[PDB]
Amino acid sequence: VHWLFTTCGASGPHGPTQAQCNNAYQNSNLSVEVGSEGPLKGIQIWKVPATDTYSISGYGAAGGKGGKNTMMRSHGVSVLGIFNLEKDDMLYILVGQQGEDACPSTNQLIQKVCIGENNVIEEEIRVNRSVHEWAGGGGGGGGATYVFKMKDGVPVPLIIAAGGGGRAYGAKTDTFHPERLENNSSVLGLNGNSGAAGGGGGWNDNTSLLWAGKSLQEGATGGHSCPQAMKKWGWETRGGFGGGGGGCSSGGGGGGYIGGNAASNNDPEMDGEDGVSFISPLGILYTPALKVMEGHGEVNIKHYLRMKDKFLKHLTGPLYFSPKCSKHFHRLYHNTRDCTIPAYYKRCARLLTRLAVSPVC
Amino acid sequence: TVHWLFTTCGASGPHGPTQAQCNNAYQNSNLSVEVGSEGPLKGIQIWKVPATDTYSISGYGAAGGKGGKNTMMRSHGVSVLGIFNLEKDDMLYILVGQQGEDACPSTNQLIQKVCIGENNVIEEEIRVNRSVHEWAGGGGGGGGATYVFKMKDGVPVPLIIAAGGGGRAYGAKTDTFHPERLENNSSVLGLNGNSGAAGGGGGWNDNTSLLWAGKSLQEGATGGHSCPQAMKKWGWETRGGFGGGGGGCSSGGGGGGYIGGNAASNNDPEMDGEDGVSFISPLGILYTPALKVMEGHGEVNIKHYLNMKDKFLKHLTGPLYFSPKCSKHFHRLYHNTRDCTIPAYYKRCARLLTRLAVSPVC
């Protein structure tokens, strides 16, 4: 009936191998060609079994957590689109991976910061009002989900569900920034800004720094951490398999069509920005860009065409809606895989909240 | 305030850590250990005692694996606190136990669809046939045990052994009815545990032969693999943790210790795996009795010996204070353990007090 594309158990900056996805779908009716080398390394290639109308549901990935627990990791954006496919077509799918959390750590000295035993960073923000020595702890940016196809060698993007920016070490306040989505190919899919932490990788750019995440046509690799942090104690918070920019004391940027810009300096309260999502004019945007993802991304492909209601208002409070956002509300409430499977009802509660503040409301 | 904390060095599963993994774990700390590369000492951390003094060695075993449901509470690992008089330049061999493999979540889509509750092939197995032998897989891995032992003329001598809890079963709806087991005499021979389809635990000195059962410390304390029939179709890998843990199948295997944990003969999705038997040697004093507290891997804390969520602890601190003969046990546990002194480990401290009340010593 449906095909679900996951990260095949791969986590971090580099993606799955062929054997990882072989084990991830062994007795399942799903087979993919995983690239062994080149820039298509870690991208799953899937053959369509019919020439029908499909509904590709792309879900980005979350950013990392800071050295504290006073933050919820910036959730990954969702983009649902209905597309027309022809039998035996090749769908190149990059299931973006989660940006690395700062905690828990295998290093005793860093784990001491994670539980509260070490206070060197708080001391530096108190005696010098800035972090220049004890860098690190800002979670790495999350990776975006890239669903695209190849047109005479050059790749054409279909859906790009952006990945969330990593959280900063001393982050406290929650995000106010809306979800950015693009429909025109006239604007370029450039990489995000990189300062101390790395910025997210775009759709097509030229990555120069190690800590900044790479673009998709560049192989889409999670950026490294800043050297100050790896040199002082080795607090590696690398970005995710999409455009995930690795994070220093500031959170790294997330990936997307346009990468999420990271903090220009080493501000321990500055989180990384989420990426910019993308929908192709060759398809139609089913539901707008909404952050919902808790961990790794995923891609759902299916053929196009009572007590559970009271449960959702307990999770999400009184949500102001517009008679315009009713169309989007219905398609979301009854036809997505989040608002139907009870285990993913926690996702649906998130989806609605962001639909209330949405720009198309 | 100086203390030496031995962890798992980031290793997991039936095989322990390497020397580089531990140098990476104790990178910028005043701790450095020697980890073996082959043989029986593969994964064990050798530690040179820095001075001649009376130390408190707190050994914590490793928890067991979850069941064939994501919403399953795991069998916690046993904690043993002891005071030992140690000499300078004494080589302390410390094995930090590793938790057993969880059944949920899992990368395989078929296995994962069982963990969320939509696929019910296991529930149909008992309806068609009386005995479950085809849809094997769903249990929890046996938690590894934590050993702290010295070497006398090349023969190993134990000091502290904190048993690891055996993993839980697929349909583990009801809880168990047994307390912690502790041995205090070397006369009692520490042998391997009883193994059925899901392997049993691992003892201190034994001659293990079953591949699905955990191995003893004299053999290497390698975790036991899962039963072959569970790898037949979907390949539900649920191996026991490093330290003598047992593979789980569907019922869940037992953890290790001085004496290996017990496992059932028939694949029952309700019966869990019995945890191992802890050990404290006669030369050291027992500070507090054995209590199940660890939620993940084990650990060891050595230190020089002297002499909002707080409300969830006060429900237990009330009666324990003046009710039994173990009032001092509660006081020293609440004021001297790093579970109760560090505010982040409050949950661990909550499991301590709870287990002090149910224990037959009180």
Side-chain angles (χ1 to χ4, degrees):
Chain A
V1 180
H2 77 101
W3 302 276
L4 192 86
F5 301 87
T6 59
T7 59
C8 300
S11 44
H14 317 292
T17 70
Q18 183 68 90
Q20 279 187 294
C21 290
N22 285 330
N23 185 63
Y25 328 124
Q26 46 179 282
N27 288 286
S28 176
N29 298 73
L30 182 70
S31 188
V32 287
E33 294 186 282
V34 183
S36 50
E37 56 198 67
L40 300 167
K41 208 195 285 176
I43 298 164
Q44 296 160 68
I45 316 144
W46 179 73
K47 196 190 275 285
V48 298
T51 177
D52 199 270
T53 312
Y54 290 91
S55 57
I56 308 153
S57 316
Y59 302 88
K65 277 191 148 216
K68 315 222 191 203
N69 298 342
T70 54
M71 58 291 280
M72 301 277 164
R73 58 168 87 116
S74 184
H75 300 263
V77 194
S78 64
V79 176
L80 264 78
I82 52 105
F83 286 85
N84 317 291
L85 279 141
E86 299 75 46
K87 197 211 167 76
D88 269 15
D89 263 344
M90 296 305 196
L91 264 168
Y92 288 68
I93 302 159
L94 188 141
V95 184
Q97 272 151 232
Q98 195 207 309
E100 281 209 353
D101 300 299
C103 305
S105 185
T106 57
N107 195 287
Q108 290 225 116
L109 187 83
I110 294 159
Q111 188 49 68
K112 271 170 90 181
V113 198
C114 286
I115 58 139
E117 203 160 25
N118 199 0
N119 63 312
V120 283
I121 315 162
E122 267 67 41
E123 274 296 288
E124 217 192 315
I125 326 163
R126 194 193 71 91
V127 304
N128 289 317
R129 230 209 286 265
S130 52
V131 179
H132 308 293
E133 189 67 77
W134 300 99
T145 291
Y146 299 91
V147 188
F148 69 103
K149 73 179 179 173
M150 288 287 172
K151 173 86 182 283
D152 294 83
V154 73
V156 170
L158 274 78
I159 287 172
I160 299 164
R167 291 272 170 196
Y169 168 78
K172 44 189 171 181
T173 52
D174 301 289
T175 174
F176 199 89
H177 302 95
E179 288 94 305
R180 280 147 280 122
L181 180 102
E182 204 54 66
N183 44 21
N184 205 349
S185 295
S186 184
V187 292
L188 308 154
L190 306 98
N191 270 45
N193 301 12
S194 307
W203 155 260
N204 188 42
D205 206 61
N206 304 306
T207 315
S208 309
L209 318 167
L210 291 135
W211 47 96
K214 291 173 195 167
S215 88
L216 180 60
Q217 284 187 240
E218 286 189 277
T221 301
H224 291 99
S225 273
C226 79
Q228 194 66 247
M230 290 299 282
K231 183 191 166 184
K232 192 71 180 187
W233 35 11
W235 204 338
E236 208 196 36
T237 51
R238 283 195 79 183
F241 183 87
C248 198
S249 208
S250 312
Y257 184 78
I258 288 142
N261 316 286
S264 45
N265 58 324
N266 196 254
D267 181 24
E269 284 96 68
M270 206 104 77
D271 310 289
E273 274 185 70
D274 300 40
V276 175
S277 272
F278 185 87
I279 183 75
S280 170
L282 295 163
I284 283 88
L285 188 84
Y286 198 77
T287 193
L290 305 150
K291 314 179 185 175
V292 38
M293 279 314 302
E294 201 191 303
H296 297 296
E298 45 166 278
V299 180
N300 195 320
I301 299 175
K302 73 152 192 178
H303 271 109
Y304 192 63
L305 289 157
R306 269 236 182 179
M307 237 299 293
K308 290 94 199 76
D309 187 271
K310 295 176 182 179
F311 174 75
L312 281 153
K313 210 193 175 176
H314 179 83
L315 275 78
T316 183
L319 291 175
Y320 325 93
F321 280 110
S322 63
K324 304 257 154 279
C325 264
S326 54
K327 290 74 188 64
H328 283 300
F329 189 106
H330 172 271
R331 299 286 141 104
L332 204 144
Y333 206 80
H334 302 100
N335 296 78
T336 167
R337 139 196 177 64
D338 317 75
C339 297
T340 53
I341 309 303
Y344 302 126
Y345 273 3
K346 287 93 197 165
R347 280 210 227 141
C348 184
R350 291 194 208 109
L351 276 159
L352 294 163
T353 323
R354 297 258 74 196
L355 189 81
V357 283
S358 71
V360 64
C361 243
Chain B
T1 50
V2 64
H3 66 92
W4 296 267
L5 186 73
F6 307 81
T7 50
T8 192
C9 299
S12 49
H15 309 98
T18 61
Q19 175 69 69
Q21 278 180 296
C22 287
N23 293 133
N24 261 100
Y26 325 122
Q27 199 189 297
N28 265 286
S29 57
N30 294 348
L31 183 70
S32 192
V33 295
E34 199 181 89
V35 192
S37 51
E38 86 306 314
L41 301 169
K42 196 178 181 178
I44 284 94
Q45 300 165 57
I46 326 178
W47 182 66
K48 181 135 128 179
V49 177
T52 308
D53 206 24
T54 320
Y55 292 83
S56 70
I57 297 105
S58 303
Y60 296 83
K66 278 184 188 178
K69 291 156 186 180
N70 190 54
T71 58
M72 280 283 120
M73 205 197 188
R74 58 173 90 255
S75 180
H76 297 283
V78 185
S79 170
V80 186
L81 269 80
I83 300 92
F84 293 86
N85 272 79
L86 299 169
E87 294 137 281
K88 190 190 176 180
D89 314 321
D90 270 6
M91 306 293 177
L92 264 174
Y93 291 72
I94 295 144
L95 194 152
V96 170
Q98 261 133 78
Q99 86 153 316
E101 270 200 55
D102 297 74
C104 302
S106 183
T107 299
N108 177 0
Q109 293 304 287
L110 181 52
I111 293 186
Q112 188 51 52
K113 217 182 177 290
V114 163
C115 289
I116 58 146
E118 283 197 305
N119 197 241
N120 56 269
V121 291
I122 302 106
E123 291 92 297
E124 297 290 295
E125 180 77 285
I126 323 118
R127 205 187 84 91
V128 181
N129 302 92
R130 288 274 175 102
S131 62
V132 179
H133 284 96
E134 279 289 318
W135 283 113
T146 287
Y147 307 89
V148 186
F149 68 100
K150 64 181 178 185
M151 287 269 275
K152 168 67 188 289
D153 304 4
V155 68
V157 170
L159 294 129
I160 285 284
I161 297 164
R168 304 291 221 91
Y170 182 91
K173 48 158 93 177
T174 51
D175 297 289
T176 56
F177 220 73
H178 46 308
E180 297 87 353
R181 299 181 212 168
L182 185 132
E183 218 64 80
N184 56 342
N185 204 330
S186 280
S187 302
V188 178
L189 313 182
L191 293 121
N192 209 84
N194 303 332
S195 310
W204 162 261
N205 186 17
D206 204 84
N207 315 75
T208 315
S209 55
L210 300 96
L211 268 154
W212 45 101
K215 288 92 196 172
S216 66
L217 185 54
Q218 302 286 342
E219 295 173 298
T222 323
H225 305 292
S226 187
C227 66
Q229 210 60 71
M231 311 300 208
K232 202 240 178 183
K233 343 116 277 286
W234 43 24
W236 203 319
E237 198 184 273
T238 300
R239 292 173 183 176
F242 176 76
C249 255
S250 33
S251 295
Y258 184 79
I259 303 144
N262 295 320
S265 304
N266 44 31
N267 293 94
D268 204 287
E270 208 274 307
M271 306 162 64
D272 292 343
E274 256 103 77
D275 322 351
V277 183
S278 300
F279 180 81
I280 185 162
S281 77
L283 50 167
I285 316 150
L286 185 124
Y287 201 63
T288 192
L291 307 163
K292 291 171 76 69
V293 298
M294 284 316 299
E295 67 278 86
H297 302 293
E299 56 167 51
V300 169
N301 192 250
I302 304 181
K303 59 152 181 178
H304 290 106
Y305 176 77
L306 282 308
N307 293 297
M308 268 278 275
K309 289 278 171 184
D310 256 9
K311 201 199 98 177
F312 285 97
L313 307 147
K314 298 299 158 288
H315 293 283
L316 303 144
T317 65
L320 289 175
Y321 172 25
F322 42 84
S323 178
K325 246 265 266 78
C326 63
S327 58
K328 198 186 176 179
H329 282 288
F330 150 79
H331 169 75
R332 69 218 302 183
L333 191 127
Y334 190 79
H335 292 250
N336 227 55
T337 314
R338 81 185 301 259
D339 302 44
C340 299
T341 56
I342 303 158
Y345 297 109
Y346 66 95
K347 284 231 264 182
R348 279 208 289 165
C349 185
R351 288 164 221 148
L352 270 165
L353 310 157
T354 304
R355 271 284 151 182
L356 193 78
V358 73
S359 72
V361 70
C362 294

